Swiss-Prot record, chain B:
Protein name (record): Spike protein S1
Biological function: Attaches the virion to the cell membrane by interacting with host receptor, initiating the infection.
Positions annotated as glycosylated: 6, 16, 45
Source organism, top-level taxon: Viruses
Length: 48, 49
């Protein structure tokens, strides 16, 4: 959508492939390897 | 953008019209500015924390 940022991703040389792509929030936001780079932030519900 | 509905494209541009920045003024509450009346209560001739 207009005014939104696309899913953060990086292309890097790995296992002799020039463009092995990796992205944020993998495997999923609940089990993410680093929640810090994931745009989905775990939050407890506030009262009301 | 605010929403995402394309209401119109008539006369839309990217000009930075606010080169002189959004104006600023200092908050001074000494005359009651920024305060509000408390519920259904009246306080007379007194100071309240
Ligand atoms: C936003 O909507 C307007 C129409 O409300 C789109 O403008 C039209 O774009 C097409 C592209 O083929 C032209 O044929 C028309 O002449 C344009 N004007 C009108 C009045 O229809 C516009 O493309 C939309 N998208 C954006 C990003 O502005
Ligand atoms: C509002 O409250 C003030 C402070 O209690 C009152 O001021 C006093 O008034 C008496 C006369 O009635 C004077 O002798 C005192 O010297 C005053 N003190 C001060 C600090 O000014 C005032 O009368 C009250 N006004 C009303 C309408 O209730
Ligand atoms: C805890 O979580 C972090 C972030 O995913 C991870 O680097 C770390 O290895 C995990 N530690 C354990 C004990 O699971
Ligand atoms: C989300 O917005 C906050 C400010 O409210 C900002 O600190 C944070 O970096 C933003 N995160 C992303 C992924 O845009
Ligand atoms: C608009 O111009 C002012 C003055 O140079 C600058 O501070 C501001 O960052 C500019 N805005 C954008 C979105 O470039």
């Amino acid at each position: 959508p207009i005014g939104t940022n696309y899913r953060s991703c990086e292309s890097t040389t790995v296992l002799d492939h020039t463009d092995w792509c990796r992205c944020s929030c993998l495997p999923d936001p609940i089990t993410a390897y680093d929640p810090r780079s994931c745009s989905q932030k775990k939050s407890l519900v506030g009262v009301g | 953008v605010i929403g995402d509905f394309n209401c119109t494209n008539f006369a839309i541009n990217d000009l930075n019209t606010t080169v002189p920045r959004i104006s600023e003024y200092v908050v001074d509450v000494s005359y009651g500015l920024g305060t509000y009346y408390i519920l259904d209560r009246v306080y007379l001739n007194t100071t309240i924390l």
